[PDB]
Amino acid sequence: MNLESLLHWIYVAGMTIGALHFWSLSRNPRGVPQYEYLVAMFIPIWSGLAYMAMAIDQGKVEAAGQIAHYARYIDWMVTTPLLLLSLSWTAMQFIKKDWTLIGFLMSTQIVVITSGLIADLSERDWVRYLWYICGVCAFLIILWGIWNPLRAKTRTQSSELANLYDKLVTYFTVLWIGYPIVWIIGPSGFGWINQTIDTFLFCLLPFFSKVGFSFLDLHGLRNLNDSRQ
Amino acid sequence: MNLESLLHWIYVAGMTIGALHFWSLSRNPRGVPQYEYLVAMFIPIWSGLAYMAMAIDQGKVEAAGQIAHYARYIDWMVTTPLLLLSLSWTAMQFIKKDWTLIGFLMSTQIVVITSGLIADLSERDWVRYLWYICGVCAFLIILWGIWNPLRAKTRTQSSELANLYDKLVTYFTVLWIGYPIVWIIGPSGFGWINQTIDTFLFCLLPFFSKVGFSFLDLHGLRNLNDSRQ
Amino acid sequence: MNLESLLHWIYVAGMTIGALHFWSLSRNPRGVPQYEYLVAMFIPIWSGLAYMAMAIDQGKVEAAGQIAHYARYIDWMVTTPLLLLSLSWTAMQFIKKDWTLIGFLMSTQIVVITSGLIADLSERDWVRYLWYICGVCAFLIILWGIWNPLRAKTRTQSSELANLYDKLVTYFTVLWIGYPIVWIIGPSGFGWINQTIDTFLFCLLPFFSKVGFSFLDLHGLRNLNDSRQ
């Protein structure tokens, strides 16, 4: 009764009803097959349980008197990668041969989330300065590489599929770069301030990315051609 | 020497000889292909070494003088998902196209296991009651969705393949519901009692479902038409 | 300040530049397709970050005044498994149907790693002797099983491919057996000596298998036939 929250509580509330909204709208989709709603169904479910937990402050251990954001990165080890996989399905409306490109995105993602779970596990104020630089640096090499698929020479192949991927990649970068920015200040990122505003900022951001990604794909593809299985 | 056990010891002993039993019987199976014993081979192997540890009292950490069932859920995070995957193989003889339902199943399971590992990691006597109802509730939505595959309208397709999944899910539910029941009483489930009967019940149940599942599929499919690679 | 390293530092240095060498050499490979350098690209990247950490003494925890090799096995939980995956690619130049043998290796692997992470998590001096023998034991049964694919009856099928996997498994066994050997002495393996030597030995060994495995495949296949996609 000394420390109660209602931000993470309502978080899971909207997530639960989200997946359910697909159960009713399943009678007929808005042009885009259920495949999109599928991956977008698991993201809210899992994260939901993790949110309500943050409310009761469950899933955190007091190391050296300092509270670690264990529940924060854990959800960022399963949700984020899944958020990366949803992109693969967005462009790939069908599969015929096992691609290796997907394996490149999955592996590189694991390396990023690693720098995120260790950042909060800083043992000293000096070590936190080293790992921090390693996190952003990783995103650099990954940015130049993820920006390769959009070859300027392949633009002759199909401009249609190129435009779609060019629109979803834009908002994608804004998010992935968003977190690294806010990290510049606050806890576990140079900044000794209250943990109230911190948990409030890292809460509203993922949300702005969750729902924002849903409506994004809707206008991204914009197709009226349906195909049953 | 003041807390020795022989229950978990015999556990791994029976699992080890189990996989080997297939190595000799591999000369020829009971009509059912080797893919069945394959998945059923990894289950006892991994879980085997896990239980053996429970005997030596390993894989457990003493936090604040409180013992945690760390190794308990661990085996339930790798074995259970595999116990689910086996169902997909028993219902699918040969694959020709990558399904998506297999993903929604493996995902929803990860959610269930999550509530299981946290259930024991209760930080308060009040937070435990909350995380508890969350686990069962999660099984509710999954129960209505898992019971969907057997559509009454798709019965016009094949009554043979249907009756196969019917008998399978039947016993599958009794088990999945079994644990949630015993949880009502005992540690990590509202019940301050000895840890002897606790580990004695939670150990006998998995074993009752381990061997019971093997003989189940044998009579479940019952086929005399084998196919080589 | 006092406890500083430099071996793990140069470790990541050689790994980062490695993957970069492929970026420039990508213009044309030494006969072997990029698939080989693909898996050989992620292995050094991830491990790199894990190494530099060992230098700044990050990733470990102080349990009862003791230092656990947490980050040590961590890399051996994702890297090692991939080390096997690379082997499946060197043998299969093209896939047409999903195999089950691939799952047999990946599964049995998780089992070995389990004994590797718990070996250092020994809570007693007696339990360490029990967990140790358990690890090498599992390595025995898998040894005969992995030595099976090279059947003497299938020699009449293809001597070319048979010779490739024969030379590949040779060096592969030398390393897999290497670690089990050194474990007979030192911390977490019967031996109360300075951690300076232990950390220095388990450092050069992996590096000896990292770069050694790269050039190994180059001379293993040695093909001039290239195929594009």
Nearest CA in chain C to B12: C134
- Other C-beta atoms lying within 10 Å of the C-beta of residue C183: 19
Asked if A31 and A222 count as a contact pair (C-beta separation under 8 A), the reply is: yes
Q: Rounded CA gap, C55 and C3, in Å?
A: 9
Q: Looking at this protein, which amino acid is placed at residue C118?
A: I
* Cα-based angle C143, C147, C152 (whole degrees, multiple of 5): 155
Tokens of C2: 């006092």
Q: Which residues of C touch A130 (CB under 8 A)?
A: 56
C199-to-A208, C136, C193, C206 alpha-carbon distances in Å: 45, 21, 11, 11
Burial state string for A35-65 with b = 16 or more CB within 10 A and e = fewer than 16: bbbbbbbbbbbbbbbbbbbbbbbbbeeeeee
Query: Which of A35, A49, A52 has the CB atom closest to B114's CB atom?
Result: A49
| CB neighbour class for C227 (10 Å; exposed up to 12, middle 13-18, buried from 19) | exposed
B186: three-class secondary structure by DSSP = coil
Asked if B108 and A44 count as a contact pair (C-beta separation under 8 A), the reply is: no
Q: Does A104 touch chain B (CB under 8 A)?
A: no
Q: Does B32 touch chain A (CB under 8 A)?
A: no
Contact B58 C123 (CB under 8 A): yes
- How was this structure determined? It was done by NMR
- Other C-beta atoms lying within 10 Å of the C-beta of residue B157: 10
Asked if B45 and C111 count as a contact pair (C-beta separation under 8 A), the reply is: yes
Asked if C212 and C171 count as a contact pair (C-beta separation under 8 A), the reply is: yes
- Report chain A's C-alpha Rg in angstroms: 19
Asked if A117 and A73 count as a contact pair (C-beta separation under 8 A), the reply is: yes
Kindly report the nearest CA distance between residue C117 and chain A, in angstroms: 18
Give me the DSSP letters along A97-111: S--SHHHHHHHHHHH
B62: three-class secondary structure by DSSP = strand
Contacts with C122 (C-beta within 8 Å, 6 or more apart), sequence order: C128, C131, C188
Residue C185 C-beta-side C-alpha neighbours within 13 Å: 8
Interface test with C, best of A62, A110, A118 (most C CBs within 10 A): A118
Q: Rounded CA gap, C65 and C222, in Å?
A: 52
Asked if B171 and B210 count as a contact pair (C-beta separation under 8 A), the reply is: no
Closest among B46, B48, B49, B39 to B84, alpha carbons compared: B39
Closest among C112, C134, C116, C138 to C68, alpha carbons compared: C116
Q: Which residues of A touch C56 (CB under 8 A)?
A: 127, 130
Backbone torsions φ then ψ of A62, nearest 5 degrees: -90, 95
Q: Rounded CA gap, B149 and B160, in Å?
A: 15
Query: Which of C42, C52, C58 has the CB atom closest to A123's CB atom?
Result: C58
Closest among C96, C124, C112 to C179, alpha carbons compared: C112
Q: Does B111 touch chain A (CB under 8 A)?
A: yes
Asked if A83 and C80 count as a contact pair (C-beta separation under 8 A), the reply is: no
Q: Rounded CA gap, B178 and B201, in Å?
A: 11
Contact B58 C131 (CB under 8 A): yes
First to last CA, chain A: 52
Backbone torsions φ then ψ of B220, nearest 5 degrees: -65, -55
B110-to-A78, B115, B140, B181 alpha-carbon distances in Å: 10, 9, 15, 20
Contact C118 B53 (CB under 8 A): yes
Q: Rounded CA gap, B120 and C76, in Å?
A: 28
Q: Rounded CA gap, C103 and C105, in Å?
A: 5
C63: three-class secondary structure by DSSP = strand
Tokens of B67: 């013992």
Q: Does A59 touch chain B (CB under 8 A)?
A: yes
Strand partners, A63: A66
C195-to-A74, A222, B50, C102 alpha-carbon distances in Å: 31, 61, 29, 37
Query: Which of A56, A78, A95 has the CB atom closest to B130's CB atom?
Result: A56
C1: three-class secondary structure by DSSP = coil
Asked if A35 and A229 count as a contact pair (C-beta separation under 8 A), the reply is: no
Contact B118 A59 (CB under 8 A): yes
Pick the CATH number of C1-229 from 2.40.50.100, 3.30.428.10, 3.40.640.10, 1.20.1070.10: 1.20.1070.10
> At A160, which helix (H) or strand (E)?
helix A159-182
Contact A114 C56 (CB under 8 A): no
Nearest CA in chain B to A94: B98
Hey, which bits of chain A come out as E strands? 62-63, 66-67
Tokens of B143: 């129960």
Q: Rounded CA gap, B45 and C131, in Å?
A: 15
Contacts with A12 (C-beta within 8 Å, 6 or more apart), sequence order: A47, A48, A49, A51, A52
Q: Does A213 touch chain C (CB under 8 A)?
A: no
Query: Which of C100, C110, C118 has the CB atom closest to B58's CB atom?
Result: C118
Tokens of B210: 């381990």
Backbone torsions φ then ψ of B189, nearest 5 degrees: -160, 40
Query: Which of C45, C49, C58 has the CB atom closest to A127's CB atom?
Result: C58
Contacts with C118 (C-beta within 8 Å, 6 or more apart), sequence order: B53, B58, B59, C131
Residue B198 C-beta-side C-alpha neighbours within 13 Å: 18
Kindly report the nearest CA distance between residue A25 and chain B, in angstroms: 16
DSSP B149: S
B67: three-class secondary structure by DSSP = strand
Q: Rounded CA gap, C70 and C60, in Å?
A: 5
Taking 3-state DSSP, the helix, strand and coil percentages for chain C, each rounded to the nearest 5, stand at 70, 0, 30
Q: Rounded CA gap, A36 and B98, in Å?
A: 16
First to last CA, chain B: 52
Q: In this structure, which long-range contacts are made by residues C117-124, counting pairs with CB atoms below 8 Å and at least 24 apart in sequence?
A: C117/C73, C117/C74, C117/C76, C117/C77, C118/B53, C118/B58, C118/B59, C119/C183, C119/C188, C119/C189, C120/C68, C120/C69, C120/C72, C120/C73, C120/C187, C120/C188, C121/B58, C121/B59, C121/C68, C122/C188, C123/B57, C123/B58
Helices (H), chain B: 7-25, 34-56, 70-91, 101-120, 127-146, 159-182, 195-221
Parallel/antiparallel/unpaired status of strands A66-67 and A62-63: antiparallel
Q: Looking at this protein, which amino acid is placed at residue C48?
A: G
Nearest CA in chain A to C79: A107
B48-to-B55, B58, B198, C137 alpha-carbon distances in Å: 11, 14, 19, 13
Asked if B94 and B85 count as a contact pair (C-beta separation under 8 A), the reply is: no
Place of tokens 């197709």: A223
Contacts with A201 (C-beta within 8 Å, 6 or more apart), sequence order: A182, A186
Helices (H), C4-96: 7-25, 34-56, 70-91
Asked if A106 and A81 count as a contact pair (C-beta separation under 8 A), the reply is: yes
B61: three-class secondary structure by DSSP = coil
Asked if A112 and A135 count as a contact pair (C-beta separation under 8 A), the reply is: yes
Closest among A178, A93, A180 to A135, alpha carbons compared: A180
Contact A114 C38 (CB under 8 A): no
Contact A114 C46 (CB under 8 A): yes
Q: Rounded CA gap, B219 and B31, in Å?
A: 10
Q: Which residues of C touch A138 (CB under 8 A)?
A: 49
> At B66, which helix (H) or strand (E)?
strand B66-67
Contact C138 B49 (CB under 8 A): yes
Nearest CA in chain B to C126: B56
DSSP A67: E
Asked if B221 and B164 count as a contact pair (C-beta separation under 8 A), the reply is: yes
Nearest CA in chain A to C35: A100
Kindly report the nearest CA distance between residue A127 and chain C, in angstroms: 7
Contact B111 A49 (CB under 8 A): yes
Tokens of A136: 């952003």
Contact A130 C56 (CB under 8 A): yes
Contact C38 A104 (CB under 8 A): yes
Place of tokens 């998995």: B206
DSSP C46: H
Q: Does B81 touch chain C (CB under 8 A)?
A: no
Closest among C104, C85, C102, C79 to A100, alpha carbons compared: C85
A216-to-A106, A147, A167, A172, B92 alpha-carbon distances in Å: 22, 19, 9, 10, 36
C25: three-class secondary structure by DSSP = helix
Q: Does C179 touch chain B (CB under 8 A)?
A: no
Contacts with A154 (C-beta within 8 Å, 6 or more apart), sequence order: A162
